[PDB]
Structure 1
Amino acid sequence: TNTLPHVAFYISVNRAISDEECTFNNSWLWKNEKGSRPFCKDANISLIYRVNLERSLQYGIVGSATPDAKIVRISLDDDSTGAGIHLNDQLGYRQFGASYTTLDAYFREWSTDAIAQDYRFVFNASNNKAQILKTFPVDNINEKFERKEVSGFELGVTGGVEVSGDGPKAKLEARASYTQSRWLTYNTQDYRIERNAKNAQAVSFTWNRQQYATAESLLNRSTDALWVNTYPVDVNRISPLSYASFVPKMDVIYKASATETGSTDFIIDSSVNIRPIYNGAYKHYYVVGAHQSYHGFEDTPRRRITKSASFTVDWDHPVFTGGRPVNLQLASFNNRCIQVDAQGRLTANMCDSQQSAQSFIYDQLGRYVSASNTKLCLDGAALDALQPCNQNLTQRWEWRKGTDELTNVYSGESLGHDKQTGELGLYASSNDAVSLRTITAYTDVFNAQESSPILGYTQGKMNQQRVGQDNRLYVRAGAAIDALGSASDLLVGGNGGSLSSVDLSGVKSITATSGDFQYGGQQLVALTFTYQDGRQQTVGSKAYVTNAHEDRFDLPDAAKITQLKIWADDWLVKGVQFDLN
């Protein structure tokens, strides 16, 4: 309670990966002939980010070497990571041959169970109120190299003596060599952490395969006699980090200005790039003889499975004052505290320790500054409302040691309240209608509001709309969701759908279906609303999509949907987020 306060919370990022999603052709050489299979067993993403919100300084601290700012920290580190990312328990392979006859072409293929070509994590601020301040790792590696430069020479002589029937021979010989080599030594990793600094609002970290990144590099045989039929891949070079378990560690820190206002959304795209491995053998025919040579095919298919989450930051949140607020409780009542409305008017309400509107920062001057609006202070000149903060002595308060009386610095009079109405005033002493007893305690204004699931994909331009007075969601749906909006003229997305309307009041849960759209790309194809009464309602179709995923959102008891966040291009909607309260 003397230290800097934080808002702190975890964001669980869980995403099971379907067998379909994990499925590819058994063959590259003979794509269509040899069929297909799942290339991973029970692939899954389970991460836990930790978020911190704080001011860069404690309230009222002056002349620090640390610039005043609003800070947002997102991290996976030693203290919190989650289970990790999994594709397989072990790696197997299947073999295939050409159905036809072969003189000089590819004749065998091995497709190996899939591994992660990369794991990737993308961080995005929704607007420019926030900029990236620093990250960990801080940057890409500036690699060091070791060069060797060698050179030398050799001088030799050889004396010879041959004796034979033909006669005696004798040789004296002399040599001189000059040698010169160049060495270069350097390091690589299984996975290299590649940082991408797109701009002030966006950065991404990709753990990308480096050593052994290609199918080619997994080969431990180059050539063979054609009677040889065996797996030419050293599966040992494929590390458990590539399929069994991967855990990222990174820190991203955004900053907003000391006076920033409004809100920003922060979006985290966690993903694995699933990559099956294809190698082939090639029958060589040259007249004299024939052999078999092994190869890796690199331009084979890959699939990126992504799970996204987002959280919202209100730059006006009490935590960004860097102060630790308290309340002022009118103690003639069992349960009444000073509370301030939007215009600053003061009333006496039942105390609620999480109500920012009952919270004040007691600053170095002895002012009681509203934690919800730091422009306003308790001013004894005018106790009907908070007044703009200034140097008025009437805005400064001191507690009478050993009592419950709060005195005003200017007049020395005490803060009193009406025993029945709780109306505030300054008094020299108590009387039958007024109590001088004020009680104060620290309040818990730092609790974090939970975040709605993103349903679908965070692709395309993102839009945001307040939910209308009529309390309805507007929809153009057909084979997929064409567009959404808060009113019929404010539709974000495409044009193609039949226009519909869904009632947002009484929704107990929403279930989105999305995936690879038959007609093109990745889209949000269906929403299903379930109400408190039990009735359901659906828009769009579950039938024009493969690699489908289902996102479910169970609304907390009696919460109302108030904001829409919609990801869409010009044709179709790609995802949506229904914000509460």
Structure 2
Amino acid sequence: MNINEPSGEAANIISQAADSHAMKYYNAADWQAEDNALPSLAELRDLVINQQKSVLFDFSQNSDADGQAEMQAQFRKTYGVGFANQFIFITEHKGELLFTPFEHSEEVDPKSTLPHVAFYISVNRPISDEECTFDNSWLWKDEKGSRPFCKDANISLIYRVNLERSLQYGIVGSATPNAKIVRISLDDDSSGAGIHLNDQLSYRRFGASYTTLDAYFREWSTDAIAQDYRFVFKTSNNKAEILETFPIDNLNVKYEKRKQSGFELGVTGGAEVSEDGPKAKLEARASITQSRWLTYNTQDYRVERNAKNAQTVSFTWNRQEYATAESLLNRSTDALWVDTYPVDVNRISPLSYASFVPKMDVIYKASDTETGSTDFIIDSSVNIRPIYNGAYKHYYVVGAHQSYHGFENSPRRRITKSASFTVDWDHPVFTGGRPVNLQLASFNNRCVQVDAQSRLTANTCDDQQSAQSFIYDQLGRYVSASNTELCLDGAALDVLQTCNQNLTQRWEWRKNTDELTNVYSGESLGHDKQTGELGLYASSNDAVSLRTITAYTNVFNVQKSSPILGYTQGKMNQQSVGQNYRLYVREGSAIDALGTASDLLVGGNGGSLTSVDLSGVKSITATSGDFQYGGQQLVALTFTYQDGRQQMVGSKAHVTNAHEDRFDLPDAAKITQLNIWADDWLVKGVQFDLNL
């Protein structure tokens, strides 16, 4: 929905864009008239990542402080991060959202199992000719005019940001922290273009406009280099503190190293350590290492780490090798007739002017009970330094010579590009839980959804909609992802209630069923088969179904693998999906064998052969129950396609106490690997690995 006209500045941005066909414009003032005017997370990801559009958000229409805060809060809640800028461009970078906040149209004129929120922030600061203009002379600065000492100078950087939670896990003395984590990185796999000052260093020669005997008489001003590059990380309040950084110690000159900066987080665990999957309560069960790769080639520069306080850290690439104009001289004395450039610019590494790509890793922590918000500020700068050298004449009696000198008091100019983003500590990703939904199984595609007034309804499932996602916490409460202060309460199931210690807010799954029970009363969660309204029931009846299905959602990070459908038994069989994009299966009363190639089937020898086409599959449903021969057993897999067609392998006829698990494939995702558990008779479980 577009309701308001574009601002004058937005019209300039749209018209000046290099690819205007890929533009998508949104005036944030529209949200006051229509809550659905803003794109949902699914729509924004589809536009930005799948369709490769450039989405422009416009906050410039109304400058009211109350309105500014409301629109920013809506943006922050929906997309995970907030900015205090009039405009925000959103584009795709490394499969994630890249935010480019800016103020003026001139700034953009081209002429696994760990739950975490990932995005990128880009800064692009062209440096004007005036900003690299210095006097042509230092000895005679008022006489020789001025010139630009750089050419097409530019700062272009991309910051990787991760919002995540670490739980405490591990042996005493080596346990992971229990803290909310904001991680900011400039790494090898997502870096921007870097900082550029010049393709090659030129110079200009000048002489004294007066006769000289014992005086400076000649000067050379060389194109500028970076005396330093600096990167400062700050916060708006003390809710966050620096926990870990790389660099940790100062780096020396001529340092060549690719550093793996690993950070250990405690997690609720994947399918390997948590058998119950989506039905598992929040509990630390494993630790994972999240690594960022940082390549250093410091050459002329040492890297100095400075921590002003617990909230601030800075990294400065400081010139150490050939750091002075004097050090660049390759001549010391000469006869007076000699007239030549006394400087060897080959002593200046190209990292100093041609291309510099900084790398660093900053990990902030906040307490596990932190609330409110914090702004994170990054100041990236280059200290532009022109180079001046001079020649001094010496006459004694009957001989003479000149000596060469460097000047270090000459002017410098620091150009800084700043960026700031806002983090909500109440974001559900900071609970450490993997988001899940509550699907009303009597319906085909209905999930529990919370509206703005916290009322509960049944809506078409959208696994990227926060209103349909919950966190199954350590007490068995179902905490809403839209508001972590609200919980699903059996005392009143028409509206979410403030989370507390009451037993009516705690839920327990009945093993090997689709039945979710309330702790206080022992009754089961039921839903009306027509309206979807929730209630507590001691049994099913004509109007009410007691079947609830839960699965992992994609509100934080898109799931790259399904949970284990069925059960694990024996050796896991990894099978890659071939170019046919087809599954081969021998079926009967159950699934005898399953495979990706007609010859390569894992399982038993019986059953009737058939094939399943993976093209257009929207979801996969696994049916299990007590088999005619044995206990709990996977007996059927149902593939549902986007057109609505369904194909089922196996059967449900020879089973009792049937229950289902549903795995929904994300859009534009390809199945590439199958993990199949089977004995000599039947297939026991299957897990799907995806690529996005």
TM-score class, shorter-chain normalisation, is 0.5 to 0.7
1:218 is aligned, of 289, 311, 328, to 328
Cα deviation 1:361-391 (Å, max 9, x = unaligned) = 2245544233344454333344234455566
Q: Percent identity?
A: 91
Long gaps (5+) in structure 2: 1-111
Aligned partners of 2:469 and 2:463: how far apart in 1?
8
**Secondary structure, in 3 states, of the residue corresponding to 1:291?**
strand
String of CA shifts for 1:122-172, please: whole Å, max 9, x gaps.
111111111111211113369999999999999999999999999999999
Structure 1 residue 290, shift from structure 2 partner: 2.0
Partners in 1 of 2:543 and 2:564 — Cα distance? 55
Bigger share in strand: 1
Match of 2:608 in 1: 498
TM-aligned CA deviation for residue 40 of structure 1? 1.6
| Helix, strand or coil at the partner of 1:173 | coil
Query: Within 2, Cα distance between the matches of 1:128 and 1:46?
Result: 29
C-alpha contact 1:336 1:351 (8 A) present in aligned 2: yes
Partner of 1:335: 445
Of 316-325 and 77-86, deviating more is 77-86
8 Å contact kept, 1:160–1:171: no
Greater CA deviation, 290-299 or 533-542?
A: 533-542
Per-residue CA deviation, residues 444-481 of structure 1 (Å, 9 max, x unaligned), is 22269999999999999999999999999999999999
SS of the residue 2:279 aligns to: strand
Larger RCO, structure (CA 8 Å, separation 6 or more): 1
Q: Secondary structure at the match of 1:118?
A: strand
CA 1:515–1:302: 2 relative to 1, 3 Å:
farther
CA distance in 1, matches of 2:424, 2:500: 25
Q: Which residue of 2 aligns with 1:550?
A: 660
Say whether the 8 Å CA contact 2:638–2:646 is kept in structure 1: yes
Seen in structure 2, the aligned counterparts of structure 1 residues 269 and 559 have a Cα distance that, compared at 3 Å, is: farther
SS at match of 2:493: coil
Deviation at 1:423, TM superposition (A): 2.4
Q: Is the 8 A contact 1:310 1:451 kept in 2?
A: no
Inter-CA distance 434–40: structure 2 relative to 1 (3 Å threshold): same
Is the CA contact 2:282–2:474 (under 8 Å) kept in the aligned structure 1?
no
Deviation by residue 1:199-228 (Cα, 9 ceiling, x = unmatched)? 122211110101211101111212111111
Within a 5 Å distance, the mapping from 1:48-447 to structure 2 comes to 48-57=158-167, 65-140=175-250, 190-333=300-443, 336-340=446-450, 345-363=455-473, 366-387=476-497, 389=499, 394-400=504-510, 404-409=514-519, 411-446=521-556
RMSD between superposed Cα atoms in Å:
30.8
| Larger fraction in helix | 2
Pair 468,171 (structure 1): closer, same or farther in 2 beyond 3 Å: closer
Secondary structure at the aligned position of 1:171 is classed as coil
Q: 1:74 to 1:101 in 2, by over 3 A?
A: same
Give me the whole-angstrom Cα distance separating, in 1, the residues matched to 2:506 and 2:630.
66
Matching residue of 1:539? 649
Q: 1:440 to 1:181 in 2, by over 3 A?
A: closer
Which deviates more, 337-346 or 526-535?
Answer: 526-535
CA spacing shift, 1:543–1:145, aligned 2, 3 Å: farther
Residue aligned with 2:268, SS: strand
Distance, in Å, in 2 between the alignment partners of 1:333 and 1:173 is: 31
Closer, same or farther in 2 for the Cα pair 1:74/1:396, shift >3 Å? same
8 Å contact 2:281–2:472 — kept in the other structure? no
Q: Distance in 2 between matches of 1:549 and 1:272?
A: 62
The farther-off stretch of 511-520 and 430-439 is: 511-520
**Aligned match of 2:562 in 416, 436, 452?**
452
| Cα 1:84/1:324, change in 2 over 3 Å | same
How many Å apart are 1:298 and its aligned residue? Answer: 0.9
Q: Distance in 1 between matches of 2:290 and 2:518?
A: 89
> Is the CA contact (8 Å cut-off) linking 2:133 and 2:146 kept in structure 1?
yes
Deviation of the 1:338 alpha carbon: 2.5
Query: In the TM superposition, what is the alpha-carbon distance from 1:315 to its structure 2 partner?
Result: 0.5
Bigger radius of gyration: 1
Residue segments in structure 1 that go unaligned for 5+ positions in a row: none
Cα deviation for residue 434 of structure 1 reads 2.2
- More displaced stretch, 570-579 vs 8-17: 570-579
Deviation at 1:20, TM superposition (A): 2.2
Would you say the 8 A contact 1:279–1:294 is kept in 2?
A: yes
CA distance in 1 between counterparts of 2:384 and 2:185 reads 24
Count residues with an aligned counterpart: 580
* Structure 1 stretch displaced more, 63-72 or 121-130: 63-72
Distance 1:329 1:560, change over 3 A: closer
Aligned mates of 1:418, 1:427 — CA distance in 2: 11
Structure 2 CA distance for aligned equivalents of residues 172 and 406 of structure 1 = 16
Is the 2:527–2:535 contact (alpha carbons within 8 Å) kept by the matching residues of 1?
yes
Measured after TM superposition, the shift of residue 321 of structure 1 is: 0.8
Separation (CA, whole Å) in 1 of partners of 2:456 and 2:284 = 109
In 2, Cα distance between equivalents of 1:24 and 1:288: 39
Once the two structures are overlaid, the 10-residue window that deviates more, 287-296 or 490-499, is: 490-499
CA 1:154–1:356 in 2, change beyond 3 Å: closer, same or farther? closer
Is the CA contact (8 Å cut-off) linking 2:179 and 2:367 kept in structure 1? yes
Instruction: Render the CA deviation track for 1:416-440: whole Å, top value 9, x for unaligned.
Output: 1223443211223333322333332
Verify the 8 A CA contact 1:70 1:256 in the aligned structure 2.
Answer: yes
Contact 1:318 1:445 in 2 (8 A): no
- Aligned pair in 2 of structure 1 residues 498, 275: CA closer, same or farther (>3 Å)? farther
**TM-superposed deviation, 1:340:** 3.9
- The 8 Å contact of residues 509 and 517 in structure 2, kept in 1 or not, is answered as yes
Q: Matched residues in 1 for 2:394 and 2:627: separation? A: 43
